[PDB]
């Protein structure tokens, strides 16, 4: 019943109170402990007091404005506290969000208009406060975003977000457009879908406009002033309630549609949101709100939310704060980028550099080749133009930033080189050799390489200090990671410059030490290798693919293998064998290598050659090659699906731990985000390193459970699953 956490026998105040001559109260949110207003213990007590005072002084209050004194409006909840919540803390988590909502419910049922003046970003808890208002005005300013992104942290909008958006938009629209994916909206878009009611050009207009809106509403709508649509007698939910025949006919398909979208991956937040939405819609507002709290508490105390908070809050923060960027290094602005190679990688790299605003010279061996490379950007711009995401003027400037050439001399004035030619050391030496004297003397000499050690590539240039691995992922326009690889000779200044470039193009960096396969390529290798091994053992291809998707990978492993190219996989294995055999050791081949060699022998080395595990026709993937079952005796081995899933996930987790032990990776943050963004490791795990400490299975949770399951897989499938000494006690 209380607006407060405690009711027995000391946090800071975050809300400024101001009451006008007209009786309008401005609540200006301004947490002294940070530059952002966050839904924390300080906020809860401050808003509790404020709401108590609103009730106590109600005879002299005519309206309320909810404002902020920060650059943003209000963003996020207390993640630090929520990440610590154990199953036994379910009561306290429940009570916390129940208290939060009791405050907003009072605000909302005051009998007076409440207006949110949204000066900047209103995200999660921030938007939830705004949704408790009767009217929302946003300043149409740059960088301003509105949305409920808590699903991206493995949470749900537990401060009324689910309940209110469903009441506003109905089940289907709230779920699909707002809740399921935690979509962020620009103010213009926010207005369009009804998340915001009005826009103003500047922040200074907000409060006066809010007060003017209160004035007009009291004059024109006295009976309905401060009454949300759902608190009115004749309220009808848009799209209907679950008991209405129209929705009832499509409702049972909502969970199946969701399961289709998620491919059977064990990510509990979206299903919890859908359950809260539908169950909420069946009952009155207050009951709906309480159900919401129970589903929230369920996610919070679960393991997946801890994985996701760790990666997508803490790890991302650490990376974006320059955690892997060397300390005492300044800035060096980039004037002219030169890309070598106009294939998918080079064309994609040119696009993202040009979209960022950089001039790009795109060089290939012929003008025809380089021009078709720019055509890649043209097709992306044409598709964005039809979707209405950019203007003709803006698009033309983007494309005009890309100059296709066949002449080496056109790399004159280039201060940042990104090479993306064929995986061959002597070719890369030769292509850099043709260019190293033509470019600016201070130019970064970057290489997009999948496996070849950067130190070995560096010998082909004079200024090895400026040579570095700049590893992108296909397709470049969609893949958010850049793996930055430090060669033995690479200077710290060179690392920082590539770090800064990565941020400038809107991508996420990790810094890796030189080692063949680096982090991403080496670890993704273990995933596809397990899949191929299973095929060799006689496991149904269809099951292997299902296992991949149900594990949470964005693409199934045999499909991915075709894209990686089996000839590349072969020479990767050939390289590892050479290292061992030259050192006098005996090489132990992965059981996948025999399956790779078999497919090469059959003339089915992947998509590029026209045939792999899948059939290809007219430039489109058709289906699984029917001869696959006879070739590998498919059906003869039928292990549990969970074993197939675990073999793939575990191989990568173990390999990530090896990378950490060897000093390839320098932080778990880089391991987690690197695996998620670079090689498509499933988001629910929180990353390949988090998977170890946050593992959850039938036989328990945590590092000890991971070790037990790893040992379980090792006995059944081979010694490669035995954990490193670093994981043992």
């Amino acid at each position: 019943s209380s607006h407060h956490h405690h009711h027995h026998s000391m946090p800071d105040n975050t809300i400024q109170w101001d009451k006008d001559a007209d009786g309008i109260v401005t609540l200006t949110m301004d947490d002294p402990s940070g530059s952002t207003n966050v839904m924390n213990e300080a906020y809860i007590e401050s808003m509790g007091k404020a709401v108590d005072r609103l009730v106590a002084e109600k005879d002299s209050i005519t309206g309320v404005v909810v404002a902020s004194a920060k650059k943003t409006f209000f963003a996020g909840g207390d993640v630090k506290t929520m990440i610590q919540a154990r199953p036994e803390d379910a009561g306290d988590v429940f009570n916390t969000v129940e208290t939060i909502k009791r405050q907003l419910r009072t605000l909302e049922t005051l009998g007076k208009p409440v207006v949110a003046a949204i000066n900047g970003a209103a995200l999660g808890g921030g938007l939830e406060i705004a949704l408790a208002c009767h009217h929302r005005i946003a300043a149409d300013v740059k960088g301003s975003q509105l949305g409920l992104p808590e699903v991206t942290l493995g949470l749900l909008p537990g401060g009324g977000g689910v309940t209110r958006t469903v009441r506003m938009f109905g089940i289907q629209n709230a779920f699909v457009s707002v809740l399921a994916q935690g979509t962020r909206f620009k103010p213009a878009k926010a207005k369009e879908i009804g998340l915001v009611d009005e826009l103003v050009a500047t922040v200074e207009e907000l409060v006066p406009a809010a007060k003017a809106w209160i004035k007009e509403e009291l004059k024109a709508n006295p009976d309905g002033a401060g009454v949300q649509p759902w608190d009115k007698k004749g309220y009808k939910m848009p799209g209907g309630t679950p008991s209405s025949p129209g929705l009832a006919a499509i409702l049972p398909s909502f969970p199946s549609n969701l399961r289709k979208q998620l491919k059977g991956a064990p990510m509990p937040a979206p299903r919890a949101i859908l359950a809260a939405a539908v169950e909420g819609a069946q009952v009155d507002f207050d009951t709906a709100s309480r159900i919401e709290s129970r589903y929230f508490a369920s996610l919070v105390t679960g393991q997946v939310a801890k994985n996701m908070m760790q990666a997508f809050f803490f790890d991302l923060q650490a990376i974006n704060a320059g955690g892997s960027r060397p300390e005492g290094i300044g800035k060096t602005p980039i004037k002219r980028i030169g890309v070598l190679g106009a294939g998918m990688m080079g064309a994609g790299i040119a696009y993202v550099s040009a979209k960022a605003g950089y001039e790009v010279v795109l060089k290939d061996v012929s003008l025809e080749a380089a021009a078709k490379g720019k055509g890649y950007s043209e097709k992306l711009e044409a598709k964005a133009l039809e979707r209405g995401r950019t203007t003709q003027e803006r698009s033309d400037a983007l494309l005009a930033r890309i100059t296709p050439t066949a002449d080496a001399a056109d790399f004159k004035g280039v201060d940042f080189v990104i090479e993306a030619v064929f995986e061959n050391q002597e070719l890369k030496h030769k292509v850099f050799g043709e260019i190293e004297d033509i470019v600016e003397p201070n130019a970064i000499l970057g290489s997009n390489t999948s496996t070849l050690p950067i130190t070995g590539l560096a010998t082909g240039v004079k200024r090895q200090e400026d040579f570095i691995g700049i590893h992108f992922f296909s397709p470049v326009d969609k893949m958010p990671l850049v793996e930055i690889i430090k060669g033995e000779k690479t200077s710290d200044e060179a690392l920082a410059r590539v770090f800064d470039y990565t941020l400038a193009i809107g991508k996420t960096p990790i810094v890796v030490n030189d080692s063949r396969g680096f982090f991403t390529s080496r670890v993704i290798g273990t995933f596809v290798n397990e899949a191929l091994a299973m095929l060799g053992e006689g496991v149904e291809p269809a099951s292997i693919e299902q296992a991949g998707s149900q594990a949470g990978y964005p693409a199934p492993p045999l499909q991915l293998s075709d894209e990686l190219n089996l000839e590349l996989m072969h020479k990767i294995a050939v390289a590892t064998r050479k290292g061992v055999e030259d050192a006098g050791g005996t090489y132990q081949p992965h059981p996948a290598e025999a399956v790779v060699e078999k497919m090469i022998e059959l003339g089915r080395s992947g998509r590029l050659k026209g045939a792999g595990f899948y059939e290809y026709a007219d430039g489109k993937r058709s289906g699984l090659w029917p001869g696959l079952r006879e070739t590998f005796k498919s059906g003869s081995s039928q292990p549990p699906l969970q074993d197939m899933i675990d073999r793939m996930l575990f191989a990568e987790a173990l390999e990530t731990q090896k990378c950490l032990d060897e000093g390839v990776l320098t932080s778990t943050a880089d391991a987690n985000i690197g695996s998620i963004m670079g090689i498509g490791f499933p988001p629910w795990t929180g990353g390949s390193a988090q998977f170890i400490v946050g593992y959850s299975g039938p036989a328990g949770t945590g590092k000890a459970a991971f070790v037990a399951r790893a040992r379980e897989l090792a006995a059944a499938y081979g010694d490669r699953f035995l954990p490193p000494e670093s994981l043992l006690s």
Binding site: P252, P255, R259, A275, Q546
Partner: protein, 401 residues
Amino acid sequence: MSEEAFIYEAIRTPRGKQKNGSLHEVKPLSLVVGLIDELRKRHPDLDENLISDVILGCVSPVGDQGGDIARAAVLASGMPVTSGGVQLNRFCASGLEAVNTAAQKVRSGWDDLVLAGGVESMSRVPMGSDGGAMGLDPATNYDVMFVPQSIGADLIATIEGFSREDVDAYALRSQQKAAEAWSGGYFAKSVVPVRDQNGLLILDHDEHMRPDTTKEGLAKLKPAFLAALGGFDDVALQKYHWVEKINHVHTGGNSSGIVDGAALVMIGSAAAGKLQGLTPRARIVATATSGADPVIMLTGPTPATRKVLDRAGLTVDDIDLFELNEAFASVVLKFQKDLNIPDEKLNVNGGAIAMGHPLGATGAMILGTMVDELERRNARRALITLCIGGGMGVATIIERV
């Protein structure tokens, strides 16, 4: 397990079609009362006070079918007030479940004479009208992988290797045999024409039937379009991970028809019938309830039939007539394949593809169909079974007396 249970009467309405159907103007309650009045006509001197219960299957007991339609029938027909009235729902098996339950009540010794059957006016109260605990609950629906019946049926065909031509060949056969049964006068005494308040004819035949169906006509039809709504194919293959692609072979022409109808069966002990001067037509030998995977949904008939055969101490060879509801062509072909049922013994008078599947009533209709055919052939034993939503199965053995 004491008193033996006997079938004394088994009657049904004709089945009215879903679109511009003759029975659309007829309340489901009227369909039941009509059958009660036919039984009254056939046995004018029966002491109705000896009827202790009326048990009706009904899958969508809402609106016209809500409020315990069995009790409504008891009171509306002017049956004695002591004659009970209970509605039950075990999806597609409801009609046979009502009969099994009636038989089991007689066997217990605590009921003497029971009316059992079912009613479904699908044109007035469509499937799914009652909501559904599973569907209104995303948390439930998500966990227990809910998949509509037709997809499971398609999946059966995919796994077993039943082609589009195979399932259509069964459909043609059903139409042929229904037409032959009707032409032969097999249904003359058991199908009771529906009439209005003035005695005027409303329907006297199974109007969903298409007796002039051809192989080519069936080949021209489109696959079923809960269907067309996406997700369910992907969900089905998440459980059945070894299957790459579901072959969609089922159409409106090889699946059961949506129809209106009711069926009534009189069940009692030997003494109860003897006291009322009733002639027993068959004995209920054994019943069984079993089940299978709820995602494939429709493979429940096989374990239920095996369990009822074992319980009665019989084998496939001992049964003269097999009657399995024709919800989907592949379900029947799968059942036939699993148990090596001879073609000449299976759904011999046609089935739901031809005549329709009025959910709650169907079990009792096909039971009555078998009582009549046993007598007509002068054969001994029939097994009656239906596939059920949720993966359930029900089966019954009857012996001609």
